[PDB]
Design a protein around this ligand. Sequence first.
Ligand SMILES: *Cc1c(COP(=O)(O)O)cnc(C)c1O
Ligand SMILES: *Cc1c(COP(=O)(O)O)cnc(C)c1O
Lengths: 394, 394
Amino acid sequence: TTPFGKPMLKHFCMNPEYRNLNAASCGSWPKTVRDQWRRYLDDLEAQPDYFSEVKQGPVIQEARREVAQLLHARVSECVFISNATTGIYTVLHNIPFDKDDVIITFSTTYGAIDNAIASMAETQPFQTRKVTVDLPMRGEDIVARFEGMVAQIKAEGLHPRLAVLETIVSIPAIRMPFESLVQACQREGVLSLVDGAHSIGQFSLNLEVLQPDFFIMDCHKWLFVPRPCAALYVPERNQHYIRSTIPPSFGFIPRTATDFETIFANVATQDNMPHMCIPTALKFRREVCGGEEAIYQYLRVLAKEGGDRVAAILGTEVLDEKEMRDCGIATVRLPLAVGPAVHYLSMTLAETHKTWLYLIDHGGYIWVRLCAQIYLDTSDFEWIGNVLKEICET
Amino acid sequence: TTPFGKPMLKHFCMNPEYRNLNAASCGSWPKTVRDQWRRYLDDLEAQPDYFSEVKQGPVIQEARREVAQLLHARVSECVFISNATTGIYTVLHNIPFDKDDVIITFSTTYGAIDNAIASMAETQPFQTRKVTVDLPMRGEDIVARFEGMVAQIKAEGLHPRLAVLETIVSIPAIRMPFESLVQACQREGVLSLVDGAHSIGQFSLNLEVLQPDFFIMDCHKWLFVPRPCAALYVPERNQHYIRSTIPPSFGFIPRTATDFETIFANVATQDNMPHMCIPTALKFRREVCGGEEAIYQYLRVLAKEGGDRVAAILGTEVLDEKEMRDCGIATVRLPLAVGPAVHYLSMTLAETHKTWLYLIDHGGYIWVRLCAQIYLDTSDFEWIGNVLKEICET
Ligand SMILES: *Cc1c(COP(=O)(O)O)cnc(C)c1O
Ligand SMILES: *Cc1c(COP(=O)(O)O)cnc(C)c1O
């Protein structure tokens, strides 16, 4: 109905002087979602205990049905949680680990996941090993080293029990061969904890075929809902491990919904408004945007072309292999070689240029994460490209 | 400026056909707070990454300063968390427990706290003992049994390490001698974890004199902010135990703000809007309500008189001792002696009578929790009293 690009800007609530090239952080949602937000806000204030005990429940169950459909998985396998950190931690904490189990990570593993595991080892006797990924790589070369580390764990007598994978590495942001890595995890009896914080709403996902052991994802990062909003997927063959939420509450389980579902329903006080907006956003995505596939192909090609376009203006490169760019994200190199410098950038991109990006010192050179969105156009990449060029020269 | 009672209703956003006798669940906030809420909502949608990285920080720090002042404690000792369950669990999880440490609870301890502790014992070797409180009691008789249990723990050779107290027992809701119990905890070297979920905004609190080892409280339950909103107080002499949030994130600590503060700042994605409204509510409470003390005395006397008034209509009693009613809560007995019955009540109080209460089968007789608020009047207690009487007879 509406074309992609700046014609979409009329359906979003962003200042015309604002260009959200970092939409996958706070999120970004259309006007029709905010309107729904305020109306639930209105209801909550009018009759608090009626909104919460009668009307709230149904909407959440619909949102679960729509997330489950978008993922090709049973609504009974999908549960709402506050954010990706809580869901990955919920899984890591329920699994009993032995003195001889090993948890495998990658140097790409999100930093908060490493802090989870380090803390778990203070009072639990398991151990850990990190697969060295120095980006760029080939997808297979990451799978190979992962194979090598499992083989070597079985050779020392220990037991490779679980591995933390990711779909999109946070930053430097690219797409990991998680399809291949889940299959590698299946062959050798290793639990595949997929950190798919960037997944739903950015590209297609079939959990029926992927069959991960656990799948966690942030809806607010790409599904046009506000932060915080995340969901957890656990197949039936694994729902027996999950016996408590984090923090524990009334649905705990000592050693017609299922018990698994009740665990994630009888929880402490939270605001389920972000989830209650999920339906509206999907409606918008179906009707105004021409369906999910339309949005995915646009996001990948914009990031493809807009990414190559920024690197041209700067004379640098977009992170790749020698497809890790099958996604609406382009990480570009910058003509650089400390933190007070990076600060200037930020507020020049903020008060001076009105926009916010995330940088990283990889390969000794600072990088930039460019987030595509259906309301951005290759000029806004040309625009930032020229903006970057300026601050760099200074 | 405005008198208490139904003249306040014009400053709140409750349906005139709604009587919130359960304000301490979802919360209840004035018009001036909602207006502030929507304006932050507006800002977040206009310039997402500028609202979050530049403007958000300052407001939260002011809110901490105002909570810390309302509690008589250093702003550096007070930190924002999502809800009371997460904060109590954050404390319980950071403290290393030995095979010979014992955690003490009471049959009044909130149910989600017991689930926390039970789960902790599956992988940690400590042990636990429960002080039997059969309400009604005298405050001293609860302190006595608590003394008895510590004496008996030291006699068996174990070490009383920590005790979970509460200010307001959830339901049947009364005030516990937590001042006395904190002093009992100090004398015998026992850590006093105060679950003060009902505390701030309901009655006066001085942490400088009380000196609890940990203090957790729900602002949204009485401080005219929306759910979820809670704060955690840890004195300096104890901030060394707290090395991670739950779930852990980037501020973790392996074995000019303080490290403690950074722990509760560098956290996963959350909405700090409830906290960012704290200032406005306090402004409202100072100006429209004539200060904090005005609100506390009104809440206690309304619950005092309105509670006695409901019990009169019903011919029953208000839970007490033979002051546990020094609070804006009255629990009344009902002329009863199962769950499908209680269901009818709910929707008759809901669709039929438009209001929601929490019942409990204590002393074999169902009880009712009456929550006073500055916008309620003794007629609304007379009103519910007559409503209760009717459904009871049927
Ligand atoms: C954003 C992100 C997270 C954490 O998401 P929260 O909502 O902050 O818990 C974790 N891992 C990766 C790779 C991410 O991109
Ligand atoms: C309300 C309450 C809690 C839990 O508060 P949440 O915000 O749901 O974590 C715990 N204990 C008591 C006594 C309460 O009244």
